């Protein structure tokens, strides 16, 4: 199984969370780690999607949604012609989400501070997977990673490895 | 009451729908029609927010969410320091959404093609409003505006005028 990780952090070099995560998958030759540039090439992006079986979108939660960089990728790479129309290029591929927040995970539920679960906030991606006939994975939510103890951090890193590689 | 309309159509100059909406509020001097440009200035945008009581975000639905330029404005204009922190600049302001789709409104519900309502898809904006202590207005969803009969177009435009100006 080939996995493409689309990494959409508009300040990736400054991220302190992402380094632990690249390190966790560096040794899996079937995993393509692919950070976006603002001027990404559509044809190249489409080519990579075609070559992979599990597509993972990896990003920080910015005001309860993906960063503008990922939104631009969605709006320009996922054309009607490619993603739907009479190609449905993504049909049968798996879509996963690795979303990181500074907030405690317990904030994201009814009656708690943010009122809404991560599932509910990620609905646009779920809708996308349904539309494009992809198989939507449970979301890997990464909460307060940099505040966690070493052993808690390691358990999330192991979950991430499995998210990228476990067939699936 | 002063209203600011953030017009985040990514190809505004070409849009066939937006001139209808601009024309509809042209006579209300307390309504500010504010196209979002690719090179917006944070300070000027923050200034406009501070000067208005009702903030309406007006955009087409692109893959079940706002266009990337609006997300960029959210990411950059709505800083921790401004929108939360010790300032909460938006506290008490109303947040409205005028979201247009090329799909029939009836696709957006459980059991239909899109499975999720517009309310569910706009959840990140509701969570933003909650976080920043804004009052979230019911969403004005605009489905297939250009296809509507002249009389239905006119009715929707009256609802739009009320949405922008009705103090209630």
Automatic annotation (TrEMBL), chains A, B:
GO molecular function, one term: electron transfer activity
The keyword Nucleotidyltransferase appears for this protein: no
Sorted UniProt keywords: Oxidoreductase
Flavodoxin-like fold domain boundaries: 1-163
Highest taxon of source: Bacteria
Protein name: NADPH-quinone reductase
Taxonomic source organism: Pediococcus pentosaceus (strain ATCC 25745 / CCUG 21536 / LMG 10740 / 183-1w)
């Amino acid at each position: 199984m080939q996995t493409l990780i689309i990494v959409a952090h508009p300040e990736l070099a400054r991220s302190n969370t992402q380094p632990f995560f690249k390190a966790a998958i560096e040794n899996f030759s079937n995993v393509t780690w692919h950070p976006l540039v603002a001027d990404f090439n559509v044809e190249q992006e489409q080519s990579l999607l075609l070559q992979n079986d599990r597509i993972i979108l990896e990003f920080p939660l910015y005001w309860y949604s993906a960063p503008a960089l990922l939104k631009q990728w969605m709006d320009t790479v996922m054309t009607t012609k490619f993603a739907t129309g009479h190609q449905y290029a993504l049909e049968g591929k798996e879509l996963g989400i690795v979303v990181s927040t500074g907030d405690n995970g317990n904030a994201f539920q009814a009656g708690a501070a943010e009122k809404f679960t991560i599932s509910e906030l990620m609905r646009p991606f779920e809708a996308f997977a349904n539309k494009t006939k992809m198989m939507y994975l449970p979301i890997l939510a990464v909460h307060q990673f940099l505040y966690l103890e070493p052993d808690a951090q390691q358990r999330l890193l192991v979950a991430y490895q499995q998210y990228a590689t476990n067939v699936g």
